Design a protein around this nucleic acid. Sequence first.
DNA 1: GATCTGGCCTGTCTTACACAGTGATACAGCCCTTAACAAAAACCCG
Length: 55
Amino acid sequence: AFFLFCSEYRPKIKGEHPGLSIGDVAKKLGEMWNNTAADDKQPYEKKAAKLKEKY
DNA sequence: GATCTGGCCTGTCTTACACAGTGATACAGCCCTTAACAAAAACCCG
């Protein structure tokens, strides 16, 4: 569920910060998705499951 | 009857056209870092 949350927060991260490296940005997004509650990634996980079922 | 001529073959003879090869440029595929979920299998006891 954290993968779709990271994918959805990547544009927010690029808007809040200019971005220096994709690796550090991805690490920070993963750390944030792990520190936040699991309910925050529920619609993201639902959209990921929908995209997996459609493809 | 002998001579000149239009038409059907025939062996070349130039050609345009399809490729051929090359250094440099441009797309176009493989790892990277979290990660919570998504699957494939081998083996074992019920």
